[PDB]
Amino acid sequence: SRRRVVITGMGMLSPLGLDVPSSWEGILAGRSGIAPIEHMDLSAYSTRFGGSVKGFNVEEYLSAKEARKLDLFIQYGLAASFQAVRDSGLEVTDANRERIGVSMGSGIGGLTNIENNCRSLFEQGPRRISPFFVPGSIINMVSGFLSIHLGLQGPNYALTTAQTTGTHSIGMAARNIAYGEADVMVAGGSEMAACGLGLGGFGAARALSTRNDEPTRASRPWDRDRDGFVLSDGSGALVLEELEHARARGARIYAELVGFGMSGDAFHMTAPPEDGAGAARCMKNALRDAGLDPRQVDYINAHGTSTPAGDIAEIAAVKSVFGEHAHALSMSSTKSMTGHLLGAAGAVEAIFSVLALRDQVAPPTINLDNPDEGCDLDLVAHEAKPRKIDVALSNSFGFGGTNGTLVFRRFA
Amino acid sequence: SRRRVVITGMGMLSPLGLDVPSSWEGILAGRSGIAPIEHMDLSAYSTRFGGSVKGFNVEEYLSAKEARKLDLFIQYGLAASFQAVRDSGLEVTDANRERIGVSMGSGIGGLTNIENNCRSLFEQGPRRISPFFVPGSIINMVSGFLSIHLGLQGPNYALTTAQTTGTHSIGMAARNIAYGEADVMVAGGSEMAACGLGLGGFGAARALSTRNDEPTRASRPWDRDRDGFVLSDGSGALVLEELEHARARGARIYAELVGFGMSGDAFHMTAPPEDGAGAARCMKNALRDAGLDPRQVDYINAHGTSTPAGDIAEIAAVKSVFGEHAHALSMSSTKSMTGHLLGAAGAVEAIFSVLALRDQVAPPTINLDNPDEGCDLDLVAHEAKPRKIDVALSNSFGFGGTNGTLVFRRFA
Ligand SMILES: C[C@@H]1CN(C(=O)c2cnsn2)[C@@H](C)CO1
């Protein structure tokens, strides 16, 4: 058998806001967090815009001195995590600290730190590399620093599954609790790759929208005029908790995590198969895990990156899985507003899926002006749609053909 | 209910050999793989030696056209994975490809590739960044490329827990199989951090031995004259397989994976606590997981990094866990010979633990000329010790206070 897992705390930094409620308010209003990137000469770059976190104050969380040791992606991870633990009301004690763990991940990790230390190295040689370069740049330091700060002695690890990281981190944390390896986990992801290396790296693959004249219209999932994804920064953290543990302390439960699916496409390094066979296996795995019929799904938070082949693969996968129910569910890409937070995408989109359940509303796909060939599902174009949502899916489909699906259900 | 997990295939690149048998012959002969580094000019660095893979031929595994796109850590990971799969005798079919997954991790991933593309960005511009920069550098792409080449459609992910990566990857892959998420997993880790940023970064932390004039004597775990770890490159992969699945196809079984432990120190970003409290909690978790009396433990492949604080913390942990039995078991650090393969350390050392079971021999801790204060266990100083080994334990500890323990035993 298996224990039930509930969500009792959420935290976030996104292009829409410095916490969950501000980000969510932007989502339901169809606001874009996309704009030209500042304090950087992007003259020679083919993309000059993305989703930056605006007005982040790390000194609300850490001393200036501890913040100087950590890459931005680690700072963002810690902010989301501290928000989530505070939101949960959880009290860490000597009696439970061995039962509380962390799995906060990243897709690309410390590019900003790698950049600034390469500068030192190339200009001045290796003796000018920061002593904290390694511990301050590696992806497991969100989990590391969080565990040290809060005294968490439970499972301590980090996933890195590129654009699937957040979804996998949450799913595998849910497994830790379900199979009795932990009673509580902080899980999700963080990313800051809106540096030269991220813009330059994705730019050289020609994977980014180049709609520099109108950055807010760049991210347009399933629209016939999409030309690639928008690079964005931020973090998402959830407090996952065994149900009886949540009930005993009188926690506020947002939703239940009922299903987790994984699959591999085994197809291509960056592109999905046209029919999204892998994404279909992954969703079917997640519904089987939850013991749910495809007919019971009401809302899907799509991966919906605004890549030509990715968006169309997801339509095919949803039609394949849901058959005569594919048109009755609502599916939206909040990446139309947030851009693509890569490893943090699945974390912020799990939070948006939980809030869709709490508020009984499907977030919009903004910029969906002319749906492409066969994009004829309910994609919640332009404006938020109040509706019945008992079951929400959140999908992530990343480089290496790695797939994750989370299934959340209303809790009463 | 929980299924049994066996090892049916193993693969390796190490400083001692281009496969498992050649690496193991070096381990048993007390041979060092440590030498001045030849692939770059280290005259400005305080450490100029490490464990390099010597004469790696990627054209034993991959077309030169493909290899040119991939960081060395991906090449090394794919080579070890290919070896492990061939060694298993497993045939991938339409009937089982959904049940076979991959979890190959890395501490740092494609630092060489990121450094080289940062040089292009700074000296020329973004137009000179490689189109293959992201899929050739990010940590999840061993799992990705392996799945694409062999057609593995099962769980596809990657851990990054610094120096604990290989142990966590293998343990969590075993849990996947134990709980029914997969029947077969390819699991382990790979690392190639021997570039300017890696040697410079660890150098800036003063974490490395600076014994440049006697590289083979630099790695001296528990020796009173140790002065830091020796940086090494390579990969380990194991094919983990559900027991009945292995029995049904007549697989050769090397050993059974009976126990997996994790814990967080919640102590310090980089320093292990002197009392080894987190390592002790981790080993106790693993022994309880394996249903064992601690007196059953015959052999411990120590983390044994040759740091002052790391080596003494492990003695304290082993004494605390095993009490008087700590004087009867054998504990050795193969890092005395291989150096520290970081995220790959746990993977090669899991392989060495299994071969310790197959051949009934404890590998030596070379260079243990003057055991330090309180390092008075059987540390298999200088020479391999033939002995009875029914149960072998492999320990890993990493930055962020992250701990892993694997427990293997003979299969009958
Ligand atoms: C493994 C796939 C295919 N590949 C090749 O270089 C290749 C080699 N033989 S046929 N194609 C790159 C696109 C990497 O991803």
- Dihedral class, residue A48 (left if φ above 0, else alpha if ψ from -120 to 50, else beta): alpha
Q: What is the DSSP letter of B59?
A: G
Cα B344 to chain centroid, rounded: 3
Closest CB to A160: pick one of B134, B160, B270.
Answer: B160
Q: B123: distance to nearest CA of chain A, Å?
A: 10
Contact A131 B196 (CB under 8 A): no
B300-B306-B309 Cα angle (round to 5): 95
Q: Is A167 helix (H, G, I), strand (E, B) or coil?
A: helix
What are residue A402's DSSP bridge partners? A264, A398
Residue located via tokens 């969080």: A146
The C-alpha atoms of residue A196 and residue A48 are separated, in whole angstroms, by 10
Contact A133 B157 (CB under 8 A): no
Q: Tell me the two tokens of residue B261.
A: 């432990």
* Residue bearing tokens 């009696």: A95
Task: Calculate the dihedral angle through the C-alpha atoms of B139, B140, B145, B150, rounding to the nearest 10 degrees.
Answer: 130
Residue A405 contacts B where some CB pair is shorter than 8 Å: no
> Cα separation of A257 and A357, whole Å?
12
CA A278 centroid distance within chain: 19
Burial A144-169 (b: 16+ CB within 10 A, else e): bbbbbbbebbbbbbbbbbbbbbbbbb
When scoring A118, A149, A397 by the number of chain B Cβ atoms within 10 A, the one with the most, hence best to mutate, is A118
DSSP H stretches of helix in B305-373: 308-322, 335-338, 345-359
- Pick A263's closest partner by Cβ from B127, B153, B270: B153
| Contacts of B398 by beta carbon, 8 Å cutoff, 6+ apart | A140, B107, B161, B162, B163, B164, B165
Burial label, A185 (beta-carbon count in 10 A; 0-12, 13-18, 19+): buried
Quote the minimal CA–CA distance from A203 to chain B in Å.
8
Ligand 1 atom showing the smallest separation from residue B148 Cα: 1
Instruction: Give the chain B residue nearest A113 (alpha carbons).
Output: B197
Give A314 Cα–ligand 1 centroid separation in angstroms: 24
- Select from B247, B116, B139 the least CA-distant residue to B183: B247
**What is the distance in angstroms between the Cα of A12 and the nearest Cα belonging to chain B?**
22
CB atoms near residue B192 (< 10 Å): 32
Cβ A179–B181 below 8 Å, yes or no? no
Using the mean position of ligand 1's atoms as its centre, give its distance from the Cα of residue B267 in Å: 44
Resolution (angstroms) stands at 1.8
- Please count the CA atoms within 13 angstroms of the CA of B328 that sit on its side-chain side: 11
Q: What kind of experiment solved this structure? A: X-ray
Is residue B63 within 6 Å of ligand 1 at its C-beta?
Answer: yes
In order of A410, B136, B279, B315, B362, the CA distances from B302 in angstroms are 47, 32, 11, 9, 11
Of B63, B65, B66, B146, the residue with max ligand 1 atoms within 8 A of its CB, to mutate for a pocket test, comes to B66
Residue nearest to atom 7 of ligand 1 (CA): B66
A124: chain B residues, CB-CB within 8 Å: none
Angle value at C-alpha A52, between B136 and A239, nearest 5 degrees: 85
B71 Cα to the center of ligand 1, angstroms = 14
- Put simply, whether B138 touches A (Cβ < 8 Å) is yes
